[PDB]
Amino acid sequence: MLDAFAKVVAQADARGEFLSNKQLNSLETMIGEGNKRLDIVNKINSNASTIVTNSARALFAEQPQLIQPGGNAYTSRRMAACLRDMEIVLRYVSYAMTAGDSSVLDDRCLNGLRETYQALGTPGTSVAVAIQKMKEASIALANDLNGVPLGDCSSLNSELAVYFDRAAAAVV
Amino acid sequence: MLDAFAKVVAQADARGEFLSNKQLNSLETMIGEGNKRLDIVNKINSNASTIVTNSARALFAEQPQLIQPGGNAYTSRRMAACLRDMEIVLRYVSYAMTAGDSSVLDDRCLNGLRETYQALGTPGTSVAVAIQKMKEASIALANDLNGVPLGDCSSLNSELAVYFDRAAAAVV
Amino acid sequence: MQDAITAVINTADVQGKYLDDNSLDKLRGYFETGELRVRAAATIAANAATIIKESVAKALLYSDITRPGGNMYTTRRYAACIRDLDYYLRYATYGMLAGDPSILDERVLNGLKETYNSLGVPIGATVQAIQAMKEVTASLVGTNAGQEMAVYFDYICSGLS
Amino acid sequence: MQDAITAVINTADVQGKYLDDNSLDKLRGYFETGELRVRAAATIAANAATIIKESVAKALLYSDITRPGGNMYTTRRYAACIRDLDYYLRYATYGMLAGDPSILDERVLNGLKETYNSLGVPIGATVQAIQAMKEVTASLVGTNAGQEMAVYFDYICSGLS
Amino acid sequence: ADLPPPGIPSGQDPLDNAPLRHYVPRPVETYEDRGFATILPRTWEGETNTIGAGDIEPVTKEEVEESRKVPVDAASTGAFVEYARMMKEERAQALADQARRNSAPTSGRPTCGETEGTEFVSNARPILVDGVKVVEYWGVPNGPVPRLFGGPG
Amino acid sequence: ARYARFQKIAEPAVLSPTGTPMTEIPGTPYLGSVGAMDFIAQEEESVAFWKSGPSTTPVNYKRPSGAQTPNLPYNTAAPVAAINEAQEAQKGQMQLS
Amino acid sequence: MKTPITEAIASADSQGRFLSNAELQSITGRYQRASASLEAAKQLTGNASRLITGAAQAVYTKFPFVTQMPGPTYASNAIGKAKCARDIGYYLRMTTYCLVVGATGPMDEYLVAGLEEINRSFELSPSWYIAALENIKNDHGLSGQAANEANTYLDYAINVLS
Amino acid sequence: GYGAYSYIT
Amino acid sequence: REIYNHREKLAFAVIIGSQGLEAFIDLLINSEEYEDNFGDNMIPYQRRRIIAQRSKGEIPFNLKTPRLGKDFLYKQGMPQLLWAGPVHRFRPQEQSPKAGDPALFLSMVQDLD
Amino acid sequence: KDNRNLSIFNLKQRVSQGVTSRRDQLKIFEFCKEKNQPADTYQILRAIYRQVFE
Amino acid sequence: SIVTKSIVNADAEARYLSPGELERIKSFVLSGQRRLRIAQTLTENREMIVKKGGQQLFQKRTDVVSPGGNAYGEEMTATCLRDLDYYLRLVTYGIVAGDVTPIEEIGLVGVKEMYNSLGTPISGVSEGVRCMKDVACSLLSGEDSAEAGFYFDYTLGAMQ
Amino acid sequence: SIVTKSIVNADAEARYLSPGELERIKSFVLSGQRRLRIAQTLTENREMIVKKGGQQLFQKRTDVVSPGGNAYGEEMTATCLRDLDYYLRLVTYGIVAGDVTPIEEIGLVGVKEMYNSLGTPISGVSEGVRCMKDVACSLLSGEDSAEAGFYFDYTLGAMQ
Ligand SMILES: *[C@@H](C)[C@H]1/C(=C/C2=NC(=C\c3[nH]c(C[C@H]4NC(=O)C(C=C)=C4C)c(C)c3CCC(=O)O)/C(CCC(=O)O)=C2C)NC(=O)[C@@H]1C
Ligand SMILES: C=CC1=C(C)[C@@H](Cc2[nH]c(/C=C3N=C(/C=C4\NC(=O)[C@H](C)[C@H]4CC)C(C)=C\3CCC(=O)O)c(CCC(=O)O)c2C)NC1=O
Ligand SMILES: C=CC1=C(C)[C@@H](Cc2[nH]c(/C=C3N=C(/C=C4\NC(=O)[C@H](C)[C@H]4CC)C(C)=C\3CCC(=O)O)c(CCC(=O)O)c2C)NC1=O
Ligand SMILES: C=CC1=C(C)[C@@H](Cc2[nH]c(/C=C3N=C(/C=C4\NC(=O)[C@H](C)[C@H]4CC)C(C)=C\3CCC(=O)O)c(CCC(=O)O)c2C)NC1=O
Ligand SMILES: C=CC1=C(C)[C@@H](Cc2[nH]c(/C=C3N=C(/C=C4\NC(=O)[C@H](C)[C@H]4CC)C(C)=C\3CCC(=O)O)c(CCC(=O)O)c2C)NC1=O
Ligand SMILES: C=CC1=C(C)[C@@H](Cc2[nH]c(/C=C3N=C(/C=C4\NC(=O)[C@H](C)[C@H]4CC)C(C)=C\3CCC(=O)O)c(CCC(=O)O)c2C)NC1=O
Ligand SMILES: C=CC1=C(C)[C@@H](Cc2[nH]c(/C=C3N=C(/C=C4\NC(=O)[C@H](C)[C@H]4CC)C(C)=C\3CCC(=O)O)c(CCC(=O)O)c2C)NC1=O
Ligand SMILES: CCC1=C(C)/C(=C/C2=NC(=C\c3[nH]c(/C=C4\NC(=O)[C@H](C)[C@H]4CC)c(C)c3CCC(=O)O)/C(CCC(=O)O)=C2C)NC1=O
Ligand SMILES: CCC1=C(C)/C(=C/C2=NC(=C\c3[nH]c(/C=C4\NC(=O)[C@H](C)[C@H]4CC)c(C)c3CCC(=O)O)/C(CCC(=O)O)=C2C)NC1=O
Ligand SMILES: CCC1=C(C)/C(=C/C2=NC(=C\c3[nH]c(/C=C4\NC(=O)[C@H](C)[C@H]4CC)c(C)c3CCC(=O)O)/C(CCC(=O)O)=C2C)NC1=O
Ligand SMILES: CCC1=C(C)/C(=C/C2=NC(=C\c3[nH]c(/C=C4\NC(=O)[C@H](C)[C@H]4CC)c(C)c3CCC(=O)O)/C(CCC(=O)O)=C2C)NC1=O
């Protein structure tokens, strides 16, 4: 497992050179970004249960299929299970938002997930709609001007969106 | 695992309706049949070892192949495994005779059995001949007029025959 | 009719040319997308009845057609209506799986507007029914295959209108 | 009639939407090809005479048509034929420079097949004459613009045939 | 041959001297399903299949907005000015013509609604009716009737 | 197929929401669960609603079957159909009134 | 599914033996209590809709804020009332399934397994359902052993929720 | 037919 | 640990086919392997999931293998893609106006000062 | 390649030309006693309905 | 469009396009990038133009939203803002067309007959479009709002 | 109508109406006022037949009434009785027509495909029409409810 620094070091040892000053300037830049990073992860970790719950409400409202008898998400077992799975993917997107690399999110969650959701009969695209809703809620939550000094979060919101888009891309 | 009742309820929940009065009349009919069912299962559970042993004797007498050196039932190991597999199939046909549904017999025994007996080199049609012999012994045992008051039981013998025919059909 | 392959052989044939790199790029395109079209046609084959039921429930439900004097008012006209949605779904699947809407030109859209303007079938309600099949079908087969089915349902909708 | 711009506003209008990025891509396409269309129209305006002479000299002269009993036998009919060629070239230029063959639907191909089948004008020889104007015109305006004029001339030939 | 199939010990073969009557051909088994046959990211070469953090490019709030809008250049603007200069004279003429047409009443029987619905539809085109002329060639010239080769040779 | 489902006549195997045919055992396509509902007679099958009383008791035994005994191959696994014909030949019925 | 027959089979299957006299006596007892259970299922199926509507009225009279509280989870929308009778209808249907099966299997596998996470994550309250099941327990109007059966399984759902 | 679709009705 | 080959699945399925589930789990737990690596009080983990510096490693066992597998997936009564046809939405056309309608602009009318 | 002027309208017409392609695409229902399948036979009956009553 | 207009006049003169005309089409097709920006801005700011223009309309003209008027009610006011949305949209079509032909054939030919058939005072319509002209000239540059504002002026001249 | 069932017959035989057929037409047009009495009684007693037949339907068949049933819900239950009202009206048309052509072409041609496309069990429809047959036979005479009840029997034979 690799964060951004472990990725830089890992590549620089895979070629076996030192770090150039250019690389070190890039690292120092990411550090100066790092307090904003932790602020976004704090906002997500706070309101996470409302993200998962509201996104599931919008999922079942826009797709009324799964709540009906004979549906994939139907039974208390199956609802809790699908509901928990949304919490899983939100958890690892929080992790990869901290690490700056999408490695832990790939290696723990996304890698091999397709073969499971095929092997259960779960419609992948409904999962993808769910992840798009958590992306909408999460970004619209991350662009809140409450509690925090004004700053530019455009690049970090773009990065976070890259992580959710990778999740929806890996289920579909 | 599903018996008759669990299959009816499971389909009725897969559509999510209640049971009609038609269904309830059918269930009440099968209950009135159920004493005869327990009588058949008692006859099978009693004389089961003679079923397995005599059917193996007729197997090896009609096909003298497998008792010979090089044959599949040639070793003490392999013969014991042969006899015990016949005991397995007779055990699950007794189970599905009690349940009234062929689900337990499929899910525990027949589902994937062919891939195994292909994967070991075992002649499947010799297994099918064995199960036909247990069908002969078991039905001719079930139609004994000993110890039981007389009545009409052709439907239940037909059903039991459907279970054995499903076993021989699933190995071959 | 023709599929995408036959259409390539038609243009290359009718110019007298051989198959050049462009036409081979088109055949590469179709052969890349083929398996996706197959599984989409499999799933539509599986759930046709529920596509027509959900699309009639979306599109013709809570409407005056049901009320006396509307065009769906009798059992004969209701059955003819859902029969025509069966035709639209099925030929839309053929058009998807061929990769060429020439089927829709030959066997569906020919004379259909003259037929519905003859009988008194409302074209607007028909087009809304087809779009309801487009939304339900795209929900079943997903994003890519929903785009493919979307071009053929939109082809039928452009044909009637 | 309509040009490519009007057609974009037709589709965007008839959906009720405003202009999205697809329609702006279509307007960018037209505005990229604009100057090419302009100079092509300039050159055809310059050499109409020579296009007609060369194409009549290739396609029609020294045959049964200008021999007595053919349709171009009298002077009146010679002049009417060259006249017709002038109209095909002029409206083909309008169709090129609009980027949309609707003009040829409105003002040329309407009733033209009924006209020529009424009078006894050979359609075959007319189509051969138009294709002669297509080759000569493409030779004057070059490759790109010759493909564009090619479309309009082939549109009129598909209309007559 | 070589080795033994993925499941059988080299020393003992289950099909040792099997009769041709009862001989089941063994199915082909590969290790493709098993987890050790999957190919991991190289990573001793300089290739790691993760795209996080490094790929994203810093973006200011304004750049996104300017990148949303259509790009403009001086050539383009200057020729817009070139367009408004030539069209200046005819736009004014179009406005004056419209005010003159709508100002003067024709005043006949109105069709639908009240007091309006006269003989000319308001803002209709004179150029659609007047433009398309009916022109007997070899007749008295209704119109200009250019002739390509008319000019005497 | 829906007619059969809504009216509880039978369950009919239909292709799965994926498309691959609904099998109970993965060897052969289109199997169904067989037990205890196949054997209950439905009133919609019978033309005759009026007769409701069977007047005998059936008793089973084994008959020697003579000719009609199917030829079987020696020393090999016989085909499934042949053994079924051998058991269909040897079924006797007594009727006690 | 947990039916008495499948408990018998499942126990003998975990032991690897046959179905000796113990399990057969089990299936006998099931076959006797079955009849009164079927009659109870017939009459619950008979008056379902008035039991569900009556149960929802009892919940609304006990907790009058729920129709007044503006929210998604509360029954103030017409959608909310539809989800209300929807859920009480689920409980009534699972009770009828357990009456037919003869054990608590369908309730334990369709309803009881994981109910808590759902009533939490959508802030649903057990108390509202409990009041619903109390009104079902009062107004089912069965008599005798059939009433003992439906009171048994309805009470069982009540004791699951608390 | 006994049920006929007139635009008038 | 992943199963060595198909034959392991075969053998161990016989012993859970006759002795029952009990004696099977008795076999795995009282085995020498389990004693050698967990002893008496340790939760079973994933052995050697990540080799070293490689980023991927292997699919987690819980994630890799799930209940209701592909062969059992196709059995009767599985979750369907569309059946119930709920009419809960009533006059849905009311929720989504077409391009021509005011309704949207009515919301703008409520906005106006 | 000379024919540098052939275009979409010209090519649609040259493709669409002769007797319509339906000739090559008629399927004919033979009832053969050799390859007799009950399922197949039923499809022939249903084809008789579709031919006679359109 | 300018292409259509050039074609119609020349076609009616039965001659090729004139040298002056083809220069006009060159200037048009090169002024294309800028026009697109103008309609891009009025496209993405439509809600403020229609709402703010509707506010200045009803504040200047309290006739039609009074009880008794044409636009009395929530539904009728919404229909009124619907029409201002139509003309705002049309103005954008006229800007990319480079001519008033799109505005004239969709929106203006026979407008007085329609609003006289609806009982609507068309002077109120013209006041609404003039209000949207003031808002849309507040959203643009100098020469830019000169041009777009003159398309609005043509629609005002068609209503009056 | 009974009259039609003859003109089509000898039309396809391309002959004038047969003498035997003609006698039936006379017997039909003389039996008219009795038929109009029957359809008058079933007309003015429709509310009792639909309500009481719906009660016997739902009491015999508690499948539909229960949640998850095709007819569950206030809107759904009302429609169910709306369809019973349709068949009852049709039965009256078939009585005054002297033939089930009105019943067949308005109600029965393609009925199985519609209710199978709605998910409705058609056996419950036939049980409902049988319930209305019992009520309508309770409201009439002996021979009278024999006749009308046999029209109901035709509809039952078409549903099953
Ligand atoms: C986009 C994410 C936000 C934005 C964030 C900013 N936060 C800034 C400064 C800052 N934030 C924190 C909180 C953070 N650091 C931690 O250690 C923890 C938790 C352990 C969290 C949640 C701190 C401590 C600071 C700096 C000290 C202070 O402000 O008192 C910040 C200022 C720029 C910068 O420091 O880089 C920004 C822009 N602000 C925005 O407007 C969007 C909404
Ligand atoms: C470490 C990461 C990690 C995950 C991401 C999950 C992924 C996951 N989900 C399920 C299992 C499941 N997941 C869902 C979820 C769904 N319900 C629906 O309606 C939707 C389509 C979807 C939510 C968006 C359901 C319903 C099941 C149970 C499926 C079933 O048993 O039919 C399973 C099988 C084991 C189980 O039953 O729990 C697994 C591995 N598990 C993990 O360990
Ligand atoms: C715990 C062990 C156990 C059993 C072994 C059975 C034994 C059993 N069988 C019947 C009763 C019966 N048993 C049979 C059986 C048949 N009659 C025939 O003529 C055929 C030869 C044979 C086919 C199987 C019949 C026909 C009846 C009477 C009909 C009936 O009760 O359904 C009864 C009813 C009571 C009585 O008769 O006194 C009982 C208890 N039940 C049990 O609880
Ligand atoms: C009842 C009749 C009957 C037969 C006719 C044989 C036929 C037969 N031969 C082999 C098997 C074999 N047969 C041969 C023989 C050959 N070696 C060569 O160099 C020659 C090509 C060929 C002799 C002419 C060999 C070598 C094998 C083993 C093949 C192997 O394992 O690679 C097998 C597979 C089982 C086994 O390994 O023994 C069978 C069924 N068996 C029977 O039961
Ligand atoms: C292929 C070989 C073959 C056989 C060997 C016979 C054997 C046989 N016999 C009978 C049946 C019979 N067999 C006899 C014969 C007897 N009468 C007596 O006094 C003596 C004890 C005995 C002669 C020595 C009688 C009387 C019946 C009729 C019995 C009855 O109906 O009561 C039946 C029952 C069917 C029937 O009624 O015919 C059969 C299978 N059938 C065969 O298919
Ligand atoms: C298999 C069994 C089974 C159940 C028992 C239900 C239980 C259940 N109810 C809801 C969900 C809900 N349940 C209700 C019901 C209520 N409205 C009120 O006014 C009352 C307090 C209460 C009725 C008595 C409401 C209103 C919601 C939606 C809550 C919300 O979104 O705010 C959800 C979340 C998913 C959804 O939105 O549908 C679940 C799992 N679902 C099942 O699958
Ligand atoms: C739950 C269901 C279930 C089954 C149905 C069996 C199926 C089965 N049989 C064997 C294994 C075996 N099965 C047989 C049986 C045969 N001997 C012959 O002469 C005949 C061809 C055939 C009996 C008709 C033999 C001999 C073996 C051992 C094969 C060998 O080791 O060579 C194995 C491998 C494990 C083992 O060695 O026990 C398995 C999975 N096991 C199960 O768990
Ligand atoms: C004049 C001839 C004629 C008939 C009969 C007719 C019936 C008809 N029944 C309908 C629905 C329906 N009909 C029923 C009927 C029933 N549900 C049950 O369980 C019972 C068995 C039964 C009532 C006795 C139900 C539930 C629906 C709606 C089902 C749904 O929408 O999900 C619809 C759907 C749309 C609409 O009603 O407007 C039509 C058109 N139409 C006709 O033109
Ligand atoms: C694939 C090739 C193909 C198509 C598509 C097709 C359509 C078609 N639709 C028809 C009638 C009809 N079509 C409808 C359709 C509708 N009613 C509604 O209210 C709905 C809005 C709408 C359907 C969405 C109805 C009611 C009739 C029957 C009119 C009548 O004869 O009474 C008929 C007359 C024949 C008949 O059905 O009796 C044809 C031929 N025919 C074809 O060969
Ligand atoms: C019945 C009325 C009628 C006339 C008159 C007529 C003339 C006619 N003259 C032609 C050519 C021609 N005509 C001439 C005539 C002349 N060259 C000179 O220098 C002299 C002044 C003059 C002879 C006195 C020449 C040279 C050509 C051929 C020119 C060329 O092909 O390059 C052609 C071209 C093809 C062809 O002849 O088959 C026609 C159709 N066609 C008609 O239907
Ligand atoms: C006497 C009564 C009678 C006539 C005259 C007749 C003509 C006739 N010509 C036909 C086709 C055709 N006709 C031609 C003819 C020509 N191709 C050329 O290039 C030449 C210039 C030209 C002939 C001089 C061709 C190529 C086709 C085939 C089109 C196709 O189906 O592929 C066909 C369609 C059937 C078929 O041949 O496949 C008919 C029916 N049919 C009749 O019953």
Chain D residues bordering chain I (beta-carbon distance below 8 Å): 15-17
Helices (H), chain D: 4-14, 21-46, 48-59, 75-98, 102-107, 112-119, 123-141, 143-160
A33 lines ligand 1 (CB under 6 A): no
Chain E CB within 8 Å of residue D86 CB: yes
Residues K58, K69: Cα–Cα separation, whole Å: 12
G74 lines ligand 6 (CB under 6 A): yes
CA within 13 Å, CB half, B19: 30
Under 8 Å between Cβ of L160 and L128:
no
- CB-based burial label for K131 (10 Å; 0-12, 13-18, 19+): buried
In this structure, what token pair is assigned to residue B29?
């009919």
Indicate which of G14, G17, G109 best probes the interface with I, i.e. most I CBs within 10 Å of its own CB.
G14
CB contact under 8 A, G16 and I88: no
For residue L68, list chain F residues with Cβ-Cβ distance below 8 A: none
Only one residue has tokens 């070629």, namely A15
Find how far residue D93's CA is from the centre of its chain. 6
Q: Kindly give the distance from the C-alpha atom of residue A154 to the centroid of ligand 1, in angstroms, as a whole number.
A: 14
CB contact under 8 A, A65 and C139: yes
CA dihedral D117, D120, D123, D129 (to 10 degrees): -140
CA dist list (Å): A61 to A65, E68, I10, K115: 9, 32, 46, 42
D47-51: long-range contacts, CB 8 A cutoff, minimum separation 24: D47/D140, D48/D86, D48/D89, D48/D90, D48/E148, D48/K16, D49/E148, D49/E149, D50/D136, D51/D89, D51/D133, D51/D136, D51/D137, D51/D140
Q: At residue I106, what is the residue type?
A: L
Residues D159, D110: Cα–Cα separation, whole Å: 9
Under 8 Å between Cβ of B17 and L69:
yes
In this structure, what token pair is assigned to residue F62?
């084994």
Nearest atom, ligand 1, residue A43 CA = 22
B147 lines ligand 3 (CB under 6 A): no
**Residue nearest (by alpha carbon) to ligand 4 atom 29:** E1
∠ CA E19-E24-E26, nearest 5°, is 125
Residues K126, K128: Cα–Cα separation, whole Å: 5
Phi, psi of J15, deg, nearest 5: -75, -40
Question: Which residue of chain G is at minimal alpha-carbon distance from L71?
Answer: G49
Our CA-based measurement puts residue I55 at a distance from the nearest CA of chain G, in whole angstroms, of 34
In this structure, what token pair is assigned to residue A155?
């690049």
Chain C residues bordering chain L (beta-carbon distance below 8 Å): 49, 52-53, 56, 74-76, 78-80, 82-83
Residues E65, E69: Cα–Cα separation, whole Å: 7
Residues C72, C82: Cα–Cα separation, whole Å: 10
Residue-wise burial string across D90-99, b where 16 or more C-beta atoms lie within 10 A, e elsewhere: bbbbbbbbbb
Under 8 Å between Cβ of B7 and B103:
yes
Instruction: Specify which residues F60 forms β-bridges with.
Output: F93
| SS3 readout for L98-147 | CCCHHHHHHHHCCHHHHHHHHCCCHHHHHHHHHHHHHHHHHCCCHHHHHH
- CB-based burial label for G108 (10 Å; 0-12, 13-18, 19+): middle
Chain E CB within 8 Å of residue B65 CB: yes
Closest ligand by atom to J17 CA = 11
CA dihedral D41, D44, D45, D50 (to 10 degrees): 180
Chain C CB within 8 Å of residue H7 CB: yes
Q: Kindly give the distance from the C-alpha atom of residue D65 to the centroid of ligand 10, in angstroms, as a whole number.
A: 14
Find how far residue L8's CA is from the centre of its chain. 23
* 3-class secondary-structure state, position F62: coil
Nearest to A7 by CA among E39, I53, I50, E59: I53
Chain F CB within 8 Å of residue L114 CB: no
D61 lines ligand 10 (CB under 6 A): yes
F67 lines ligand 5 (CB under 6 A): no
Residue B112 CB coordination number (10 Å): 18
E18 lines ligand 4 (CB under 6 A): yes
For residue F6, list chain L residues with Cβ-Cβ distance below 8 A: 116, 119-122
Nearest to E148 among D24, D49, D80 (CB): D49
Residues E29, E32: Cα–Cα separation, whole Å: 9
CA within 13 Å, CB half, C100: 17
Final resolution, Å: 3.5
Find how far residue I95's CA is from the centre of its chain. 35
* 3-class secondary-structure state, position B124: helix
Q: At residue L36, what is the residue type?
A: L
* 3-class secondary-structure state, position F93: strand
Nearest atom, ligand 3, residue B37 CA = 24
Neighbouring subunits of B (3+ Cβ pairs under 8 A): A, E, F, G, I, L
Q: What is the DSSP letter of J8?
A: H
∠ CA D101-D105-D110, nearest 5°, is 155
Question: Which residue of chain B is at minimal alpha-carbon distance from F32?
Answer: B102
Nearest to J3 among C1, C2, C15 (CB): C15
Phi, psi of A61, deg, nearest 5: -75, -45
For residue E138, list chain D residues with Cβ-Cβ distance below 8 A: 76
For residue C143, list chain A residues with Cβ-Cβ distance below 8 A: 125, 128, 172
Residue-wise burial string across L130-142, b where 16 or more C-beta atoms lie within 10 A, e elsewhere: bbbbebbbebbee
Indicate which of E16, E17, E22 best probes the interface with B, i.e. most B CBs within 10 Å of its own CB.
E22
Chain L CB within 8 Å of residue H2 CB: yes
Our CA-based measurement puts residue A41 at a distance from the nearest CA of chain G, in whole angstroms, of 22
CB contact under 8 A, K30 and E79: yes
Under 8 Å between Cβ of B18 and L63:
yes
Nearest to G114 among A53, A56, A80 (CB): A80
C62 lines ligand 8 (CB under 6 A): no
Residues C75, E120: Cα–Cα separation, whole Å: 50
Residues K84, K56: Cα–Cα separation, whole Å: 12
Q: Kindly give the distance from the C-alpha atom of residue F63 to the centroid of ligand 5, in angstroms, as a whole number.
A: 10
CA dist list (Å): C110 to A167, B70, C114, C130: 46, 71, 9, 17
Residues I78, I69: Cα–Cα separation, whole Å: 12
In this structure, what token pair is assigned to residue I15?
């012993």
DSSP element (H, E) containing F57? strand F57-61
Instruction: Specify which residues F95 forms β-bridges with.
Output: F58
Chain K CB within 8 Å of residue E150 CB: no
CB contact under 8 A, G121 and A53: yes
Residues D26, D29: Cα–Cα separation, whole Å: 5
Instruction: Name the CA radius of gyration of chain E, rounded.
Output: 44
Under 8 Å between Cβ of K40 and E69:
yes
Nearest to H3 among C74, C119, C120 (CB): C74
**Residue nearest (by alpha carbon) to ligand 3 atom 39:** B35
Nearest to L68 among G42, G46, G93 (CB): G93
- Tell me if there are at least 3 CB pairs under 8 Å linking chains D and J: yes
Nearest to L123 by CA among F52, F43, F12, C81: F43
Residue-wise burial string across L18-33, b where 16 or more C-beta atoms lie within 10 A, e elsewhere: eeeeeebbeebeeeee
